[PDB]
């Protein structure tokens, strides 16, 4: 409602770097808010795409940002009569970024990995990898839970069970308030999808440079399966955390699987032990139900509610014709121990191929009426197809069926305005939560500041 | 007695006709002061109104093009008529309605294009050997139904990029089957092999030189191939006046839109042709898979009938996709594609077993109603689609147009076309709301309040500005 669409702030990065593919707010040890931005196609040392991360200080004028430097050199270690290899070429560093405390977690879902033993090999595959940084101290660490030293022959003999060679860890990410990094890996277990959890502190204290393969005893990966419903389900395309069991000492995980059960799609709520609590099933095949998930309490009963985006949902129209527009589903958590029922609300896009639901950002309380609100992106919506972000306000009964405000893309066509979102943080310290929108197609980030209500 | 035409107490000839389709207007001078000039045409002549001064438009509907339905689609330069009449002239007065008929025929011996799009992933290794004579055998079977057959061939696997593609060792790029004891082709997304031609033995010989490749993940990028085979008109070689059959065969799941992000691909599919002179899809590694809605748009745009010829283990999958892509047919494929021939013949018959009308550019104020006549002269009210038809059958529909009031523009036109058909009925509408006596009005007439008014159709109207 009260986001200022007139006086925006623009940060920008190199041309063709996809600056703004991922973003998040970041507070230093002194509470000073900044913006971390991922640029998965930034050039490395050998003039080859490797990705990069930027840490943008807050300035109402915007402008350029300094790099958050990580190691971009390929590594090699000859140990145990084997040869370990990391390949950072086109790894996509910055394809996902997230901030917790004074720590940044930038991930390269397509960093490749191989192991050589004489004439055999483990196969050069995208295990993924995440880079962790404490900017103030300069501390650095890594986390690649899917690296293995098993050879190709073994997987074949064991029928490709527990095959984490194509995890792409870091595809999606989130950090619990307790400090536990949860990575989505939609390619784990031969494209079934897995989750990988581990405390940030243990990642840092157990990491040394050059080891490549090391143990993180406190980590916890999810489990393989033989159920064909999970095949090619990309379990971990998106991830979020919340409280859905009533026990405040336990943290529950929300996981998106947009191709679960033959492209039907599903979202699953789990405990920290990956034991399934609930499962929301897609409404339409190939709609990519689960592409984006969000957790926030919208009706002000203290119980987190769940939002799921199906950007490719095809709405029904006259004369038996369908129209891809996208759709978002709202699930309100019931009082006490009960199962999440049918959707409480269906928000559907309007612009053809607009992909309404591609991103869903909790905004906090934007208008300060006591109910938290959200923002939904249509990266190719709007009358011009340039992109659109729609705001929906919370209410006692859930959300409003119509948007209170619409942000049209200030960028040219193809900017993917809204592909990434993040809100619920006050960057200018005016008492109102603000919104940052990414447009990787234009290599820019747009900051909308919330002002008092007119 | 008094009726709605008089009791309404109209002011002009235009307002008179707008009351009801039955009203009329008398523009004669010699008319009593008490007698109304807006009444039934029977009452005006009864009151000695000059016949030439009577304005009474009648809603009509006369044909302009009424070619006869062709008995054979063979021969000709596509001078084949399959819809009659092809054009009519409609005239409606306010709030009236007129009906008319249209005939549609599933012409016999109509040309056909069949493009064979085949999965050549390693899972289809034994399927290639069962279609080496398909071209000649398929010619023998379609020869019974059409004298103009053209067939072509294309193949696909998946996006040649990690993780779909094996990238180690270096030998695995040239030979994906390197770790085993066989050679297979380097991986490829989609490659056009044979343009639609009537030389069926070119199909056989091109097939006999094809071999499979090998990729990692079970779902295959066959939807990229469906898009390119649809939007690359000149390269596949679809004919303007012919049935377009796109036979899609596979034994596995398929990749869909937004899957490409597991290879670093985020760019949406633009729906444009990207098959160069090398006959390979060049946007395979840079452009995401297409969506079901975008596929439907280009399939409907190019009049392509998609046929999912998949194995038992994925029929339910593609039967559910077929429902999200109307006009699509599904058939069950044996584990070696031995029955692909009868599968096609049955699909072509099922395709031409329906006639569904479609309306384009219908004005807002116009509403249509349909009554179908399928099978043996059996009327089916409120229906605009027949089913269970056979080649050579003929159906007809009765249509009624109902206009609401009078629009601004007095001439518009819309089209009635069956789904997938070339010919169509064009309806030229003309809204007759005005009176001919308005074209001979007297602005600033001496008869109307010392020139303060206008005299038209035998009455004084207030001029502009008043
Ligand atoms: C292609 O599309 C078809 C049609 O949509 C899919 O088939 C459906 O699959 C779903 C899920 O597997 C089925 O839903 C289940 O229905 C069961 C009862 O169905 C009865 O009624 C139908 C009416 O036609 C009969 O055909 C059927 O034989 C039964 O008599 C319920 O028992 C299920 O509920 C249970 O499981 C769910 C979780 O899924 C729980 O939430 C419930 O509480 C409960 O425990 C469920 O509702 C549906 O019946 C199927 N329809 C048909 C016609 O078969 C295919 O799966 C799909 N295939 C592919 C490859 O995409
Ligand atoms: N629980 C798990 N961790 C797990 C889940 C699913 C799979 C899987 O889908 N495997 C299918 C891989 C596949 O089908 N590859 C294709 C690639 C291609 O089509 O070229 C193939 O060659 N399929 C062949 C050979 C084959 C290869 C691997 C496994 C079985 C069979 C066939 O189905 O005949 C594997 C593991
Ligand atoms: C479609 O069929 C309906 C009903 O069979 C037709 O409506 C009838 O028309 C006659 C003749 O004008 C009337 O006497 C009846 O009262 C109507 N019955 C209804 C409306 O239920 C209708 O005219 C047909 N439409 C077309 C376009 O042929
Ligand atoms: C309208 O229907 C009548 C039957 O009531 C029919 O005689 C007439 O031909 C139809 N109109 C046209 C233009 O065919
Ligand atoms: Ca809990
Ligand atoms: Ca709630
Ligand atoms: Ca609010
Ligand atoms: Ca603010
Ligand atoms: Ca594949
Ligand atoms: Mg295959």
Please give the DSSP secondary-structure letter assigned to residue A449.
Answer: P
Q: Closest-lying ligand to the alpha carbon of B88?
A: 4
**Under 8 Å between Cβ of A363 and A403:** no
Ligand 4 atom at minimum distance from B400 CA? 1
Phi, psi of A222 (to 5 degrees): -75, -170
**Under 8 Å between Cβ of A345 and A330:** yes
Closest-CA residue of A relative to B317 is: A262
Please give the DSSP secondary-structure letter assigned to residue B173.
Answer: H
Closest-CA residue of A relative to B316 is: A262
**Under 8 Å between Cβ of A3 and A435:** yes
Strand runs (DSSP E) across A393-432, as ranges?
394-395, 398-399, 405-408, 420-425
Smallest Cα distance from A399 to chain B, Å: 28
The residue whose two tokens read 């098959």 is: B275
Q: Token digits for B394?
A: 């003929």
Cα–Cα distance for residue pair A255/A267, rounded to 1 Å: 6
Ligand 3 atom at minimum distance from B399 CA? 27
The residue whose two tokens read 């269970």 is: B388
Looking at residue A132, which CATH number applies to its domain? 2.130.10.130
Residue B399 Cβ contacting ligand 3 at under 6 Å: yes
**Under 8 Å between Cβ of B299 and A293:** no
Report the SS3 class of residue A443: coil
Q: Which residue from B381, B382, B398 has its CB within 8 A of the most atoms of ligand 3, so it is best to mutate?
A: B381
Cα–Cα distance for residue pair B151/B146, rounded to 1 Å: 13
Cα–Cα distance for residue pair A274/A95, rounded to 1 Å: 25
Contacts for A217 with CB less than 8 Å, ≥ 6 apart: A202, A206
Closest-CA residue of B relative to A321 is: B326
Our measurement of the distance from residue A139's CA atom to the centroid of its chain's CA atoms, rounded to an integer in Å, reads 24
The residue whose two tokens read 């084949």 is: B80
Give the burial class of A338: count Cβ atoms within 10 A of its Cβ; 0-12 exposed, 13-18 middle, 19 or more buried: exposed
Angle, helices B340-351 vs B134-142, to 10°: value is: 30
Q: Token digits for B424?
A: 């169509």
**Under 8 Å between Cβ of B17 and B39:** no
Cα–Cα distance for residue pair A123/A386, rounded to 1 Å: 41
Q: Token digits for B69?
A: 């339905």
Please give the DSSP secondary-structure letter assigned to residue B449.
Answer: T
Which 3-state string (H, E, C) describes A8-72? CEEEECCCCCCCCCEEEEEECCCCCEEEEEEECCCECCCCCECEEEEEEECCCCCECCCEECCCC
Q: Which residue from B218, B262, B314 has its CB within 8 A of the most atoms of ligand 2, so it is best to mutate?
A: B218
Mutate to test the interface with B, among A90, A191, A309, A316 (most CBs of B within 10 A): A191
Q: Answer whether the bond into residue A62 is a cis peptide, omega within 30°.
A: no
Q: Which H/E stretch holds residue B281?
A: none
- Sequential DSSP letters for B192-235: EEEEEES-THHHHHHHHT------SSSSB-HHHHHHHHHH-HHH
Smallest Cα distance from A428 to chain B, Å: 33
- Sign of the alpha-carbon dihedral angle for B307, B318, A239, A310: positive
Contact B293 A352 (CB under 8 A): yes
Cα–Cα distance for residue pair B7/B380, rounded to 1 Å: 40
Q: Residues of A with CB below 8 A from B217's CB?
A: 190-191, 232
Cα–Cα distance for residue pair A44/A193, rounded to 1 Å: 29
Cα–Cα distance for residue pair B173/B54, rounded to 1 Å: 87
Across B370-380, b (16+ Cβ under 10 Å) vs e yields bbbbbeeeeee
Give the burial class of B419: count Cβ atoms within 10 A of its Cβ; 0-12 exposed, 13-18 middle, 19 or more buried: middle
Phi, psi of B17 (to 5 degrees): -65, -30
Q: Which of B451, B364, B347 is nearest to B407 (CA)?
A: B364
Domain count, chain A: 1
Smallest Cα distance from B429 to chain A, Å: 23
**Under 8 Å between Cβ of B127 and B337:** yes
Residue A130, domain extent: 1-454
The residue whose two tokens read 């279609």 is: B131
Strand ranges of the sheet holding B23-26, from the earlier edge strand across to the other edge: B38-40, B23-26, B54-55
Cα–Cα distance for residue pair A203/A196, rounded to 1 Å: 12
Residue B61 Cβ contacting ligand 4 at under 6 Å: yes
Q: Residues of B with CB below 8 A from A171's CB?
A: 262
**How many interchain CB pairs under 8 A, A with B?**
94
Cα–Cα distance for residue pair A200/A216, rounded to 1 Å: 11
Give the burial class of A243: count Cβ atoms within 10 A of its Cβ; 0-12 exposed, 13-18 middle, 19 or more buried: middle
**Under 8 Å between Cβ of A145 and A216:** yes
Contact B324 A322 (CB under 8 A): yes
Q: Which H/E stretch holds residue A154?
A: helix A152-157
Residues of chain B that touch chain A, judged by Cβ-Cβ distance less than 8 Å: 162-163, 166-169, 179, 216-219, 253, 256-259, 262, 264, 266, 268, 291-294, 296, 316-317, 320-321, 324, 326, 358
Q: Using CA atoms of A353, A357, A363, A364 in order, give the dihedral in degrees to the nearest 10.
A: 160
Give the β-pairing of A373-378 and A388-392: antiparallel
Closest CB from B167, B258, B320 relative to A291: B258
How was it solved? X-ray
Residue with the smallest CA separation from ligand 4 atom 4 is: B99
Give the burial class of A383: count Cβ atoms within 10 A of its Cβ; 0-12 exposed, 13-18 middle, 19 or more buried: exposed
- Sequential DSSP letters for A219-274: -EE------GGGTT--TTSEEEEE--SS-TTS-EEEEEETTHHHHT-EEEEE-TT-
Q: Which of A282, A269, A118, A273 is nearest to A197 (CA)?
A: A273
Give the β-pairing of B425-431 and B87-92: parallel
Q: Closest-lying ligand to the alpha carbon of A372?
A: 7
Cα–Cα distance for residue pair B286/B174, rounded to 1 Å: 21
Q: Left, alpha or beta for A80 (phi > 0: left; psi -120 to 50: alpha)?
A: left
Cα–Cα distance for residue pair A235/B164, rounded to 1 Å: 17
Smallest Cα distance from A93 to chain B, Å: 11
Please give the DSSP secondary-structure letter assigned to residue B264.
Answer: T
Mutate to test the interface with A, among B292, B300, B308 (most CBs of A within 10 A): B292
Cα–Cα distance for residue pair B444/A359, rounded to 1 Å: 67
Tell me the CA–centroid distance for residue B338 and ligand 3, in Å. 52
Cα–Cα distance for residue pair A452/A152, rounded to 1 Å: 61
Residues of chain A that touch chain B, judged by Cβ-Cβ distance less than 8 Å: 40, 90, 92, 110, 112, 114, 121, 123-126, 152, 166, 168, 171, 186-187, 190-191, 231-232, 234, 258-259, 262-263, 284-286, 288, 291, 311-312, 314, 319-324, 352-353, 380, 416, 440
Residue with the smallest CA separation from ligand 4 atom 11 is: B100
Closest CB from B162, B316, B320 relative to A126: B162
**Under 8 Å between Cβ of B410 and B423:** no
Give the β-pairing of A82-87 and A112-117: antiparallel
Residue with the smallest CA separation from ligand 4 atom 13 is: B100
**Under 8 Å between Cβ of B221 and B187:** no
Across A15-39, b (16+ Cβ under 10 Å) vs e yields eebbbbbbbbbbeeeeeebbbbbbb
Residue A160 Cβ contacting ligand 2 at under 6 Å: yes
**Under 8 Å between Cβ of B277 and A256:** no
**Under 8 Å between Cβ of A297 and A243:** no
Q: Token digits for A324?
A: 């891809």
Residue B114 to residues A388, B142, B237, B247, B248: CA-CA distances in angstroms? 42, 10, 10, 7, 11
Give the β-pairing of A252-257 and A434-439: unpaired
The residue whose two tokens read 């599904």 is: B330
**Under 8 Å between Cβ of A105 and A97:** yes
**Under 8 Å between Cβ of B114 and B134:** no
Cα–Cα distance for residue pair B212/B120, rounded to 1 Å: 5
Q: Which of A351, A360, A300, A293 is nearest to A326 (CA)?
A: A351
Count CB-CB contacts under 10 A for residue B382.
8
- Sequential DSSP letters for B359-416: EES--TTEEEEEEEEETTTEEEET--EEES--TT-EEEEEEEEEE-S--SSSEEEEEE
Resolution in units of Å? 2.7
Cα–Cα distance for residue pair B421/B429, rounded to 1 Å: 23
Tell me the CA–centroid distance for residue A300 and ligand 7, in Å. 10
Cα–Cα distance for residue pair A453/A74, rounded to 1 Å: 52
Cα–Cα distance for residue pair B5/B19, rounded to 1 Å: 6
Tell me the CA–centroid distance for residue B94 and ligand 4, in Å. 20
- B219 annotated to bind ligand: yes
Residue A390 to residues A133, A361, A368, A381, A443: CA-CA distances in angstroms? 33, 10, 18, 10, 21
**Under 8 Å between Cβ of B393 and B105:** yes
Contact B324 A126 (CB under 8 A): no
In chain A, % helix, strand, coil (3-state, to 5) comes to 5, 40, 50
Cα–Cα distance for residue pair A391/A381, rounded to 1 Å: 14
**Under 8 Å between Cβ of A285 and B324:** yes
- B113 annotated to bind ligand: no
Cα–Cα distance for residue pair A421/A447, rounded to 1 Å: 10
Q: What domains are defined for chain B?
A: 1-57 (3.30.1680.10), 58-106+356-466 (2.60.40.1510), 107-355 (3.40.50.410)
- B287 annotated to bind ligand: no
- Sequential DSSP letters for B33-74: SSS-SEEEHHHHHHTT--GGGEE----EEEEEE-PPPPS--S
Contacts for A73 with CB less than 8 Å, ≥ 6 apart: A45, A88
């Amino acid at each position: 409602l009260n986001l200022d669409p007139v006086q925006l702030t623009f940060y920008a990065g190199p041309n063709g770097s996809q600056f703004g593919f991922s973003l998040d707010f970041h507070k230093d040890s002194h509470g000073r808010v900044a913006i971390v931005v991922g640029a998965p196609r930034t050039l490395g040392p050998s003039q080859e795409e490797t990705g990069g991360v930027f840490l943008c200080p807050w300035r109402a004028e915007g402008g350029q940002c300094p790099s958050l430097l990580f190691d971009l050199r390929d590594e090699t270690r000859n140990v145990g009569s084997q040869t370990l290899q990391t390949f950072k070429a086109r790894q996509g560093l910055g394809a996902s970024v997230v901030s917790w405390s004074d720590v940044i977690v930038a991930c390269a879902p397509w960093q490749h990995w191989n192991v050589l033993e004489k004439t055999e090999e483990a196969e050069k595959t995208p295990v993924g990898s995440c880079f962790l940084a404490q900017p103030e101290s300069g501390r650095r660490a890594e986390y690649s839970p899917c690296r293995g030293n098993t050879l190709s022959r073994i997987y074949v003999e064991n029928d490709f069970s527990w095959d984490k060679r194509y995890c792409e860890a870091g595809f999606s990410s989130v950090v619990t308030q307790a400090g536990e990094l949860v990575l989505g890996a939609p390619g784990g277990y031969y494209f079934l999808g897995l989750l990988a959890q581990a405390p940030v502190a243990d990642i840092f204290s157990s990491y040394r440079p050059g080891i490549l393969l090391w143990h993180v005893s406190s980590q916890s990966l999810s489990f393989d399966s033989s159920n064909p419903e999970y095949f090619d389900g990309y379990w971990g395309y998106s991830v979020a955390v919340g409280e859905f069991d009533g026990d405040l000492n336990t943290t529950e995980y929300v996981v998106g699987a947009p191709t679960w059960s033959w492209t039907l799609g599903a979202v699953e709520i789990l405990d920290s032990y990956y034991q399934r609590l609930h499962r929301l099933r897609g409404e339409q095949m190939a709609s990519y139900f689960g592409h984006s998930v969000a957790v926030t309490d919208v009706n002000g009963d203290g119980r987190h509610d769940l939002l799921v985006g199906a950007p490719l949902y095809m709405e029904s129209r006259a004369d038996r014709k369908l129209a891809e527009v996208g759709r978002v589903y709202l699930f309100l958590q019931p009082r006490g121990p009960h199962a999440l029922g049918a959707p409480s609300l269906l928000l559907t896009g309007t612009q053809l191929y607009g992909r309404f639901g591609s991103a869903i950002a909790p905004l906090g309380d934007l208008d300060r009426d006591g109910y938290n609100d959200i923002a939904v992106a249509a990266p190719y919506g709007g009358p011009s197809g340039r992109g659109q972000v729609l705001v929906f306000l919370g209410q006692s009964e859930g959300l409003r069926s119509r948007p209170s405000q619409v942000l049209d893309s200030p960028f040219p066509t193809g900017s993917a305005f809204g592909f990434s979102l993040r809100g619920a943080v006050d960057i200018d310290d005016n008492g109102y939560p603000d919104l940052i929108v990414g447009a990787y197609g234009a290599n820019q980030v747009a900051v909308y500041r919330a002002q008092p209500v007119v | 007695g008094p009726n709605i035409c008089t009791t309404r107490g109209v002011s002009s000839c235009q307002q008179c006709l707008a009351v009801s389709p039955m009203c009329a207007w008398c523009s004669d001078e010699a008319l009593p002061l008490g007698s109304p000039r807006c009444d039934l045409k029977e009452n005006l002549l009864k009151d000695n109104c000059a016949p030439e001064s009577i304005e009474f438009p009648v809603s009509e509907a006369r044909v302009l093009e009424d070619r006869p339905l062709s008995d054979k689609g063979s021969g000709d330069s596509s001078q084949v008529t399959q819809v009659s009449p092809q054009r009519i002239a409609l005239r409606l007065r306010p709030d009236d309605s007129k009906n008319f008929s249209i005939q549609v025929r599933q012409v016999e011996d109509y040309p056909v294009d069949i493009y064979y799009l085949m999965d050549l992933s390693y899972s289809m290794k034994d399927d290639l050997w069962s279609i080496q004579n398909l071209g000649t055998k398929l010619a023998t079977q379609m020869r019974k139904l059409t004298s103009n057959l053209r067939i072509g061939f294309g193949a696909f696997v998946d996006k040649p990029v990690s993780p779909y593609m094996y990238i180690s060792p270096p030998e695995a790029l040239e030979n994906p089957c390197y770790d085993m004891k066989t050679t297979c082709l380097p991986m490829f997304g989609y490659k056009h092999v044979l343009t639609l031609t009537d030389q069926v033995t070119r199909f056989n010989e091109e097939v006999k030189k094809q071999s499979v490749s090998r990729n990692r993940d079970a779902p295959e990028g066959g939807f990229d191939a469906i898009m390119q085979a649809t939007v690359c008109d000149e390269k596949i070689g679809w004919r303007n006046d012919a049935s377009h059959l796109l036979v899609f065969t596979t034994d596995a799941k398929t990749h869909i839109a937004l899957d490409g992000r597991l290879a670093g691909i985020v760019q949406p599919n633009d729906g444009q042709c990207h098959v160069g002179s090398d006959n390979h899809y060049s946007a395979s590694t840079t452009m995401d898979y297409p969506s079901l809605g975008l596929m439907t748009e280009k399939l409907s745009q190019k009049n392509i009938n998609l046929i999912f010829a998949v194995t038992e283990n994925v029929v339910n999958l593609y039967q559910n996709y077929s429902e999200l892509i109307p006009g699509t047919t599904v058939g069950v494929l044996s584990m070696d594609s031995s029955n692909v021939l009868q599968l096609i013949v049955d699909a072509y018959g099922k395709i031409r077993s329906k006639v569904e009308l479609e309306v384009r550019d219908l004005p807002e104020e116009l509403s249509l109603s349909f009554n179908a006549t399928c099978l043996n002269n059996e009327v089916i009210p409120g229906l605009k689609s027949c089913m269970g038809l056979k080649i050579g059958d003929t159906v007809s529909f009765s249509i009624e147009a109902k206009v609401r009031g009078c629009p601004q523009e007095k001439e518009k036109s819309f089209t009635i076309k069956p789904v997938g058909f070339k010919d169509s009925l064009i309806v030229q509408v003309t809204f007759d709301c005005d009176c001919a006596c308005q074209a001979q009005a007297e602005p600033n007439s001496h008869r109307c309040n010392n020139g303060n008014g206008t005299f038209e159709c035998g009455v004084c109207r207030c001029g502009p500005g008043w």
